[PDB]
Every structure is written in C-alpha cells, then in structure tokens.
Amino acid sequence: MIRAVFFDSLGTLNSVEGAAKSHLKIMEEVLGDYPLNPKTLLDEYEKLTREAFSNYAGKPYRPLRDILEEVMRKLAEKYGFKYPENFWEISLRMSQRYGELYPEVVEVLKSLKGKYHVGMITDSDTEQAMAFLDALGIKDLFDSITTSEEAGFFKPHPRIFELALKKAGVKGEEAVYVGDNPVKDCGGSKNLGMTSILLDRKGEKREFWDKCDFIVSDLREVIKIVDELN
Ligand SMILES: *CC(=O)c1ccccc1
C-alpha cells in the first residue's frame, strides 16, 4: 500500500526553463558592464557545475554554497572580472523572482496531500531548498523536506532516501519517488524498494525508460499510478 509520494526539485516541481532564465540574469548582474558575453559565462558555469556534481554524486555532503562559490571564483579569475562576494545572495534573489512551477504542480500536490504523505527529496542545502519553496508558495504543501545536508550524503546515496522514509514512517515499498534523473532518482530510490516514476516532460530520456518502474510526462499521471497500485 502506497502511503507516501516523494518529489525531486529541479525539473520536477520548478522548471528548468525558469532556472535557465534566472541563471542568465545571475551571470548578467555578476558581470554588469564587463565585456564578457553573459551567455558564454553561463555555458562555462554549467559545464563546471556539471563536472562538480558528478564528482560528488553519492559521496559525503559538502555545502553547495562552497562548491558553487568555488566554480565562480575560478570563472572570475579566468575571465578577469571581480568575484561577487554576494554571489549566493544574487543567486537566491534571482532564483526566487524568475523561478516558476510547472503548470500542474499545485494541483497535483493538493490532490495528494491529505491522502498520502507528500515529501521532497533534493540535492541542495536546506536553507536554499526552504527559501525556494517559500518563494514559490508551496512550502506548506509538503509533510517532509529532506536534503542531502540533513542526510550527510548526495544522491544516489541511500541515506537521503532512508531519511525521507523515516520522516514519513513508512517502508520503501509503501513510497513513490518522482524525478527526472534516471540514475540519481530511479537507481537511488530502487535500492530501498521504492516505486520509481521517471518524469520525462520532453521525451528526451527514452534510453532510460526500461529501468524505472513508470514513466510520465506530466505530474497529473502520478495520482493515476498511485491509484492503479492501491
Ligand atoms: C543556479 C541557481 O539557480 C542557484 C544557485 C545557488 C543558489 C540558488 C540558486
């Protein structure tokens, strides 16, 4: 019996498009009048951050603020502009003003809460996860918010999932996890017997469909699956 439904953050609740728009305005405010194409700075920022997150996958937690400030200090020295000491604050402000939820998030979160435990499991520092849920107005729709900072390990380490299930007081077999990253999400949640639901909004992850238990393009399909199984 499924009694809990857990969600990832980026790509599941808040749109990658909104994050890309926010990230661009972040690099813009960092550069100001500096003669560096903010688009080139962003592409290089995403390349370095992808490499960093890959090195830390499944490993002990390190503050994301430190990891990202390290990347931007390297980019500042590379291109010659002043490292903004308030980079973290700028990222928070812009993320909150231009971040947006997918059109069906609130509807889905409401239909689930009350019937099942509704939780989030995210690779991010707890401060930023809470501030972003608040800026998007959906913090009160979750019964639990579980972060790599709390568990001490990044996904797909099982501890972050273990902690989520413990907060809800359910077994893995009684829980669903929804996300768009086949390895960190389906693989990490499958270790505990959770039902994995892959979210492929644009149908770009067909090569990983055969490993996750279910695949959906819209979160409104999650409620259907939970009913089919119960
Ligand atoms: C990249 C991005 O959106 C971000 C980075 C650090 C803190 C908050 C948001």
PDB file of C-alpha atoms and ligand atoms in Angstrom:
ATOM      1  CA  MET A   1       0.000   0.000   0.000  1.00  0.00           C
ATOM      2  CA  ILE A   2       1.469   3.314  -1.154  1.00  0.00           C
ATOM      3  CA  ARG A   3       1.222   5.894   1.636  1.00  0.00           C
ATOM      4  CA  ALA A   4       3.872   8.455   0.608  1.00  0.00           C
ATOM      5  CA  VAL A   5       4.785  10.292  -2.600  1.00  0.00           C
ATOM      6  CA  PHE A   6       8.191  11.991  -2.790  1.00  0.00           C
ATOM      7  CA  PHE A   7       9.326  14.539  -5.375  1.00  0.00           C
ATOM      8  CA  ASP A   8      12.631  15.868  -6.644  1.00  0.00           C
ATOM      9  CA  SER A   9      13.059  19.629  -7.080  1.00  0.00           C
ATOM     10  CA  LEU A  10      14.665  20.928 -10.278  1.00  0.00           C
ATOM     11  CA  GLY A  11      12.967  19.607 -13.404  1.00  0.00           C
ATOM     12  CA  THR A  12      10.082  18.124 -11.390  1.00  0.00           C
ATOM     13  CA  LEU A  13       8.482  20.970  -9.405  1.00  0.00           C
ATOM     14  CA  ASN A  14      10.305  24.091 -10.650  1.00  0.00           C
ATOM     15  CA  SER A  15      11.008  24.485 -14.351  1.00  0.00           C
ATOM     16  CA  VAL A  16      14.451  24.123 -15.893  1.00  0.00           C
ATOM     17  CA  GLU A  17      13.403  26.983 -18.179  1.00  0.00           C
ATOM     18  CA  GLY A  18      12.840  29.309 -15.231  1.00  0.00           C
ATOM     19  CA  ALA A  19      16.152  28.256 -13.702  1.00  0.00           C
ATOM     20  CA  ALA A  20      17.892  28.941 -17.020  1.00  0.00           C
ATOM     21  CA  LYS A  21      16.296  32.394 -17.159  1.00  0.00           C
ATOM     22  CA  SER A  22      17.338  33.008 -13.548  1.00  0.00           C
ATOM     23  CA  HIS A  23      20.869  31.723 -14.154  1.00  0.00           C
ATOM     24  CA  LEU A  24      21.257  34.084 -17.117  1.00  0.00           C
ATOM     25  CA  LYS A  25      20.184  37.144 -15.124  1.00  0.00           C
ATOM     26  CA  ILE A  26      22.504  35.995 -12.330  1.00  0.00           C
ATOM     27  CA  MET A  27      25.519  35.994 -14.653  1.00  0.00           C
ATOM     28  CA  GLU A  28      24.299  39.328 -16.043  1.00  0.00           C
ATOM     29  CA  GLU A  29      24.267  41.009 -12.628  1.00  0.00           C
ATOM     30  CA  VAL A  30      27.654  39.456 -11.818  1.00  0.00           C
ATOM     31  CA  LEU A  31      29.231  40.888 -14.976  1.00  0.00           C
ATOM     32  CA  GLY A  32      27.389  44.189 -15.290  1.00  0.00           C
ATOM     33  CA  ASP A  33      29.316  46.188 -17.883  1.00  0.00           C
ATOM     34  CA  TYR A  34      32.202  43.711 -18.133  1.00  0.00           C
ATOM     35  CA  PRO A  35      32.973  42.822 -21.798  1.00  0.00           C
ATOM     36  CA  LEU A  36      32.083  39.136 -21.413  1.00  0.00           C
ATOM     37  CA  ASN A  37      29.064  37.598 -23.126  1.00  0.00           C
ATOM     38  CA  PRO A  38      26.922  36.502 -20.143  1.00  0.00           C
ATOM     39  CA  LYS A  39      25.767  33.550 -22.264  1.00  0.00           C
ATOM     40  CA  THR A  40      29.350  32.305 -22.596  1.00  0.00           C
ATOM     41  CA  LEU A  41      29.826  32.700 -18.841  1.00  0.00           C
ATOM     42  CA  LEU A  42      26.671  30.657 -18.218  1.00  0.00           C
ATOM     43  CA  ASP A  43      27.654  27.810 -20.554  1.00  0.00           C
ATOM     44  CA  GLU A  44      31.058  27.602 -18.865  1.00  0.00           C
ATOM     45  CA  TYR A  45      29.354  27.821 -15.467  1.00  0.00           C
ATOM     46  CA  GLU A  46      27.058  24.908 -16.331  1.00  0.00           C
ATOM     47  CA  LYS A  47      29.981  22.831 -17.619  1.00  0.00           C
ATOM     48  CA  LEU A  48      31.993  23.314 -14.422  1.00  0.00           C
ATOM     49  CA  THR A  49      28.972  22.690 -12.185  1.00  0.00           C
ATOM     50  CA  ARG A  50      28.067  19.504 -14.063  1.00  0.00           C
ATOM     51  CA  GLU A  51      31.620  18.246 -13.523  1.00  0.00           C
ATOM     52  CA  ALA A  52      31.439  19.168  -9.832  1.00  0.00           C
ATOM     53  CA  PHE A  53      28.087  17.475  -9.206  1.00  0.00           C
ATOM     54  CA  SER A  54      29.362  14.322 -10.924  1.00  0.00           C
ATOM     55  CA  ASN A  55      32.387  14.181  -8.610  1.00  0.00           C
ATOM     56  CA  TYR A  56      30.108  14.422  -5.543  1.00  0.00           C
ATOM     57  CA  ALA A  57      27.303  12.062  -6.599  1.00  0.00           C
ATOM     58  CA  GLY A  58      26.717   9.507  -3.857  1.00  0.00           C
ATOM     59  CA  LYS A  59      29.530  10.984  -1.745  1.00  0.00           C
ATOM     60  CA  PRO A  60      29.571  12.696   1.669  1.00  0.00           C
ATOM     61  CA  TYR A  61      27.845  16.062   1.731  1.00  0.00           C
ATOM     62  CA  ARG A  62      29.709  19.307   1.082  1.00  0.00           C
ATOM     63  CA  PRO A  63      27.855  22.649   1.203  1.00  0.00           C
ATOM     64  CA  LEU A  64      26.610  23.514  -2.275  1.00  0.00           C
ATOM     65  CA  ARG A  65      27.418  27.150  -1.490  1.00  0.00           C
ATOM     66  CA  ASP A  66      31.091  26.194  -1.193  1.00  0.00           C
ATOM     67  CA  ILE A  67      31.017  24.109  -4.383  1.00  0.00           C
ATOM     68  CA  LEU A  68      29.368  26.842  -6.459  1.00  0.00           C
ATOM     69  CA  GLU A  69      31.400  29.702  -4.977  1.00  0.00           C
ATOM     70  CA  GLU A  70      34.482  27.665  -5.897  1.00  0.00           C
ATOM     71  CA  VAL A  71      33.370  27.387  -9.533  1.00  0.00           C
ATOM     72  CA  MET A  72      32.570  31.094  -9.839  1.00  0.00           C
ATOM     73  CA  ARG A  73      35.855  32.114  -8.212  1.00  0.00           C
ATOM     74  CA  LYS A  74      37.577  30.053 -10.915  1.00  0.00           C
ATOM     75  CA  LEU A  75      35.493  31.707 -13.641  1.00  0.00           C
ATOM     76  CA  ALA A  76      36.176  35.183 -12.240  1.00  0.00           C
ATOM     77  CA  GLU A  77      39.936  34.608 -12.271  1.00  0.00           C
ATOM     78  CA  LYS A  78      39.714  33.048 -15.742  1.00  0.00           C
ATOM     79  CA  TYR A  79      37.913  35.980 -17.385  1.00  0.00           C
ATOM     80  CA  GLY A  80      39.205  38.807 -15.187  1.00  0.00           C
ATOM     81  CA  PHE A  81      36.015  40.225 -13.675  1.00  0.00           C
ATOM     82  CA  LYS A  82      35.537  40.864  -9.970  1.00  0.00           C
ATOM     83  CA  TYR A  83      34.327  37.868  -7.998  1.00  0.00           C
ATOM     84  CA  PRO A  84      30.988  38.987  -6.471  1.00  0.00           C
ATOM     85  CA  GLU A  85      31.157  38.262  -2.748  1.00  0.00           C
ATOM     86  CA  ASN A  86      27.328  38.314  -2.727  1.00  0.00           C
ATOM     87  CA  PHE A  87      27.056  35.627  -5.428  1.00  0.00           C
ATOM     88  CA  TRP A  88      24.993  33.403  -3.129  1.00  0.00           C
ATOM     89  CA  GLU A  89      22.558  36.220  -2.326  1.00  0.00           C
ATOM     90  CA  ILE A  90      22.264  37.142  -6.012  1.00  0.00           C
ATOM     91  CA  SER A  91      21.526  33.523  -6.930  1.00  0.00           C
ATOM     92  CA  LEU A  92      18.854  33.370  -4.218  1.00  0.00           C
ATOM     93  CA  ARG A  93      17.157  36.623  -5.235  1.00  0.00           C
ATOM     94  CA  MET A  94      17.074  35.940  -8.980  1.00  0.00           C
ATOM     95  CA  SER A  95      16.017  32.312  -8.496  1.00  0.00           C
ATOM     96  CA  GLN A  96      13.074  33.478  -6.380  1.00  0.00           C
ATOM     97  CA  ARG A  97      11.887  36.253  -8.719  1.00  0.00           C
ATOM     98  CA  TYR A  98      12.018  34.335 -12.016  1.00  0.00           C
ATOM     99  CA  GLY A  99      11.631  30.746 -10.825  1.00  0.00           C
ATOM    100  CA  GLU A 100       8.301  29.169 -11.687  1.00  0.00           C
ATOM    101  CA  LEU A 101       6.405  25.939 -11.103  1.00  0.00           C
ATOM    102  CA  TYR A 102       5.186  23.656 -13.848  1.00  0.00           C
ATOM    103  CA  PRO A 103       1.500  24.384 -14.539  1.00  0.00           C
ATOM    104  CA  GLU A 104       0.224  21.245 -12.767  1.00  0.00           C
ATOM    105  CA  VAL A 105       2.404  21.210  -9.628  1.00  0.00           C
ATOM    106  CA  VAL A 106      -0.014  22.871  -7.199  1.00  0.00           C
ATOM    107  CA  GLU A 107      -2.938  20.796  -8.487  1.00  0.00           C
ATOM    108  CA  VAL A 108      -1.003  17.544  -8.038  1.00  0.00           C
ATOM    109  CA  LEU A 109       0.420  18.466  -4.628  1.00  0.00           C
ATOM    110  CA  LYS A 110      -3.063  19.306  -3.332  1.00  0.00           C
ATOM    111  CA  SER A 111      -4.719  16.136  -4.641  1.00  0.00           C
ATOM    112  CA  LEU A 112      -2.052  14.049  -2.896  1.00  0.00           C
ATOM    113  CA  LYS A 113      -1.789  15.800   0.470  1.00  0.00           C
ATOM    114  CA  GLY A 114      -4.311  14.526   2.996  1.00  0.00           C
ATOM    115  CA  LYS A 115      -4.451  11.127   1.304  1.00  0.00           C
ATOM    116  CA  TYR A 116      -0.709  10.378   1.282  1.00  0.00           C
ATOM    117  CA  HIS A 117       2.453  11.745   2.832  1.00  0.00           C
ATOM    118  CA  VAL A 118       3.883  14.383   0.483  1.00  0.00           C
ATOM    119  CA  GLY A 119       7.619  14.982   0.667  1.00  0.00           C
ATOM    120  CA  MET A 120      10.541  16.449  -1.226  1.00  0.00           C
ATOM    121  CA  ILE A 121      13.992  14.886  -1.582  1.00  0.00           C
ATOM    122  CA  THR A 122      16.597  17.209  -3.078  1.00  0.00           C
ATOM    123  CA  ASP A 123      20.352  17.600  -3.548  1.00  0.00           C
ATOM    124  CA  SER A 124      20.659  21.080  -2.086  1.00  0.00           C
ATOM    125  CA  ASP A 125      21.450  22.878   1.132  1.00  0.00           C
ATOM    126  CA  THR A 126      18.433  23.074   3.408  1.00  0.00           C
ATOM    127  CA  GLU A 127      18.457  26.884   3.536  1.00  0.00           C
ATOM    128  CA  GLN A 128      18.057  27.270  -0.230  1.00  0.00           C
ATOM    129  CA  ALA A 129      15.504  24.457  -0.517  1.00  0.00           C
ATOM    130  CA  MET A 130      13.262  26.151   2.055  1.00  0.00           C
ATOM    131  CA  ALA A 131      13.739  29.662   0.659  1.00  0.00           C
ATOM    132  CA  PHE A 132      12.847  28.453  -2.839  1.00  0.00           C
ATOM    133  CA  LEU A 133       9.744  26.561  -1.701  1.00  0.00           C
ATOM    134  CA  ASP A 134       8.690  29.728   0.137  1.00  0.00           C
ATOM    135  CA  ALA A 135       9.276  31.974  -2.880  1.00  0.00           C
ATOM    136  CA  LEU A 136       7.166  29.573  -4.963  1.00  0.00           C
ATOM    137  CA  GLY A 137       4.438  29.425  -2.306  1.00  0.00           C
ATOM    138  CA  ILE A 138       4.320  25.629  -1.938  1.00  0.00           C
ATOM    139  CA  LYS A 139       6.292  25.029   1.270  1.00  0.00           C
ATOM    140  CA  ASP A 140       3.088  24.305   3.219  1.00  0.00           C
ATOM    141  CA  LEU A 141       2.098  21.554   0.749  1.00  0.00           C
ATOM    142  CA  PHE A 142       4.816  19.159   1.978  1.00  0.00           C
ATOM    143  CA  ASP A 143       4.752  16.933   5.046  1.00  0.00           C
ATOM    144  CA  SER A 144       8.536  16.471   4.874  1.00  0.00           C
ATOM    145  CA  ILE A 145      11.503  18.200   3.248  1.00  0.00           C
ATOM    146  CA  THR A 146      14.668  16.087   3.116  1.00  0.00           C
ATOM    147  CA  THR A 147      18.012  17.359   1.850  1.00  0.00           C
ATOM    148  CA  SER A 148      21.487  15.980   1.270  1.00  0.00           C
ATOM    149  CA  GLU A 149      22.650  18.342   4.024  1.00  0.00           C
ATOM    150  CA  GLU A 150      20.421  16.576   6.559  1.00  0.00           C
ATOM    151  CA  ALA A 151      21.321  13.047   5.453  1.00  0.00           C
ATOM    152  CA  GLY A 152      25.037  13.777   5.017  1.00  0.00           C
ATOM    153  CA  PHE A 153      25.314  12.330   1.503  1.00  0.00           C
ATOM    154  CA  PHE A 154      24.386  13.313  -2.037  1.00  0.00           C
ATOM    155  CA  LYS A 155      22.079  11.240  -4.195  1.00  0.00           C
ATOM    156  CA  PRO A 156      22.041   8.423  -5.166  1.00  0.00           C
ATOM    157  CA  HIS A 157      23.386   7.545  -1.717  1.00  0.00           C
ATOM    158  CA  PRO A 158      20.602   5.586   0.040  1.00  0.00           C
ATOM    159  CA  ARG A 159      20.826   7.613   3.268  1.00  0.00           C
ATOM    160  CA  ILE A 160      18.897  10.589   1.886  1.00  0.00           C
ATOM    161  CA  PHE A 161      16.070   8.262   0.845  1.00  0.00           C
ATOM    162  CA  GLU A 162      16.287   6.334   4.127  1.00  0.00           C
ATOM    163  CA  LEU A 163      15.860   9.628   5.979  1.00  0.00           C
ATOM    164  CA  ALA A 164      12.867  10.619   3.843  1.00  0.00           C
ATOM    165  CA  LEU A 165      11.108   7.311   4.530  1.00  0.00           C
ATOM    166  CA  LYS A 166      11.899   7.547   8.247  1.00  0.00           C
ATOM    167  CA  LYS A 167      10.428  11.059   8.419  1.00  0.00           C
ATOM    168  CA  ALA A 168       7.237   9.658   6.880  1.00  0.00           C
ATOM    169  CA  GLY A 169       7.242   6.491   8.993  1.00  0.00           C
ATOM    170  CA  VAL A 170       6.738   4.152   6.024  1.00  0.00           C
ATOM    171  CA  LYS A 171       8.656   1.351   4.365  1.00  0.00           C
ATOM    172  CA  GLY A 172      10.278   1.851   0.984  1.00  0.00           C
ATOM    173  CA  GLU A 173       7.702  -0.459  -0.590  1.00  0.00           C
ATOM    174  CA  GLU A 174       4.995   1.975   0.584  1.00  0.00           C
ATOM    175  CA  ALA A 175       6.589   5.016  -1.091  1.00  0.00           C
ATOM    176  CA  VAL A 176       6.869   6.535  -4.564  1.00  0.00           C
ATOM    177  CA  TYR A 177       9.641   8.815  -5.827  1.00  0.00           C
ATOM    178  CA  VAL A 178       9.292  11.144  -8.822  1.00  0.00           C
ATOM    179  CA  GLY A 179      12.184  12.797 -10.644  1.00  0.00           C
ATOM    180  CA  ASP A 180      13.835  13.413 -13.995  1.00  0.00           C
ATOM    181  CA  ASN A 181      17.327  11.986 -13.332  1.00  0.00           C
ATOM    182  CA  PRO A 182      17.324   8.235 -14.129  1.00  0.00           C
ATOM    183  CA  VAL A 183      20.467   7.358 -12.146  1.00  0.00           C
ATOM    184  CA  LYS A 184      20.154   9.591  -9.075  1.00  0.00           C
ATOM    185  CA  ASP A 185      16.401   9.041  -8.723  1.00  0.00           C
ATOM    186  CA  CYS A 186      15.245   5.676 -10.091  1.00  0.00           C
ATOM    187  CA  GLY A 187      18.524   3.987  -9.177  1.00  0.00           C
ATOM    188  CA  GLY A 188      18.851   5.553  -5.739  1.00  0.00           C
ATOM    189  CA  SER A 189      15.221   5.023  -4.734  1.00  0.00           C
ATOM    190  CA  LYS A 190      15.109   1.469  -6.117  1.00  0.00           C
ATOM    191  CA  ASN A 191      17.731   0.404  -3.559  1.00  0.00           C
ATOM    192  CA  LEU A 192      15.086   0.813  -0.830  1.00  0.00           C
ATOM    193  CA  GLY A 193      12.239  -0.841  -2.741  1.00  0.00           C
ATOM    194  CA  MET A 194      10.511   2.436  -3.584  1.00  0.00           C
ATOM    195  CA  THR A 195       8.387   2.675  -6.712  1.00  0.00           C
ATOM    196  CA  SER A 196      10.289   4.893  -9.151  1.00  0.00           C
ATOM    197  CA  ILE A 197       8.435   7.230 -11.517  1.00  0.00           C
ATOM    198  CA  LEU A 198      10.594   8.896 -14.159  1.00  0.00           C
ATOM    199  CA  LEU A 199       9.440  12.333 -15.322  1.00  0.00           C
ATOM    200  CA  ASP A 200      10.360  12.884 -18.987  1.00  0.00           C
ATOM    201  CA  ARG A 201       8.449  16.038 -19.892  1.00  0.00           C
ATOM    202  CA  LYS A 202      10.080  16.363 -23.329  1.00  0.00           C
ATOM    203  CA  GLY A 203      10.571  12.657 -24.080  1.00  0.00           C
ATOM    204  CA  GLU A 204      14.362  13.026 -24.171  1.00  0.00           C
ATOM    205  CA  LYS A 205      15.231  10.129 -21.822  1.00  0.00           C
ATOM    206  CA  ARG A 206      13.837   7.135 -23.732  1.00  0.00           C
ATOM    207  CA  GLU A 207      17.158   5.312 -23.282  1.00  0.00           C
ATOM    208  CA  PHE A 208      16.475   5.039 -19.519  1.00  0.00           C
ATOM    209  CA  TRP A 209      12.767   4.136 -19.563  1.00  0.00           C
ATOM    210  CA  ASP A 210      13.291   0.373 -19.258  1.00  0.00           C
ATOM    211  CA  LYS A 211      14.863   0.703 -15.776  1.00  0.00           C
ATOM    212  CA  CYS A 212      12.338   2.901 -13.944  1.00  0.00           C
ATOM    213  CA  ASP A 213       9.030   1.397 -12.847  1.00  0.00           C
ATOM    214  CA  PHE A 214       6.921   4.080 -14.554  1.00  0.00           C
ATOM    215  CA  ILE A 215       7.465   6.978 -16.948  1.00  0.00           C
ATOM    216  CA  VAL A 216       5.255  10.073 -17.130  1.00  0.00           C
ATOM    217  CA  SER A 217       5.349  13.386 -18.984  1.00  0.00           C
ATOM    218  CA  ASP A 218       3.010  15.212 -16.572  1.00  0.00           C
ATOM    219  CA  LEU A 219       2.775  15.019 -12.789  1.00  0.00           C
ATOM    220  CA  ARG A 220      -1.006  14.570 -13.053  1.00  0.00           C
ATOM    221  CA  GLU A 221      -0.253  10.984 -14.126  1.00  0.00           C
ATOM    222  CA  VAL A 222       1.302  10.265 -10.714  1.00  0.00           C
ATOM    223  CA  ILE A 223      -2.078  10.217  -8.952  1.00  0.00           C
ATOM    224  CA  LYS A 224      -3.305   7.686 -11.520  1.00  0.00           C
ATOM    225  CA  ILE A 225      -0.370   5.341 -10.892  1.00  0.00           C
ATOM    226  CA  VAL A 226      -0.806   5.563  -7.114  1.00  0.00           C
ATOM    227  CA  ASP A 227      -4.451   4.545  -7.561  1.00  0.00           C
ATOM    228  CA  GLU A 228      -3.676   1.727 -10.007  1.00  0.00           C
ATOM    229  CA  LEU A 229      -1.285   0.265  -7.424  1.00  0.00           C
ATOM    230  CA  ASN A 230      -3.554   0.742  -4.393  1.00  0.00           C
TER     231      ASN A 230
HETATM  232  C1  LIG B   1      21.970  28.286 -10.255  1.00  0.00           C
HETATM  233  C2  LIG B   1      20.851  28.649  -9.281  1.00  0.00           C
HETATM  234  O1  LIG B   1      19.745  28.794  -9.679  1.00  0.00           O
HETATM  235  C3  LIG B   1      21.151  28.823  -7.794  1.00  0.00           C
HETATM  236  C4  LIG B   1      22.452  28.719  -7.328  1.00  0.00           C
HETATM  237  C5  LIG B   1      22.718  28.878  -5.978  1.00  0.00           C
HETATM  238  C6  LIG B   1      21.684  29.140  -5.094  1.00  0.00           C
HETATM  239  C7  LIG B   1      20.384  29.244  -5.560  1.00  0.00           C
HETATM  240  C8  LIG B   1      20.118  29.086  -6.909  1.00  0.00           C
END
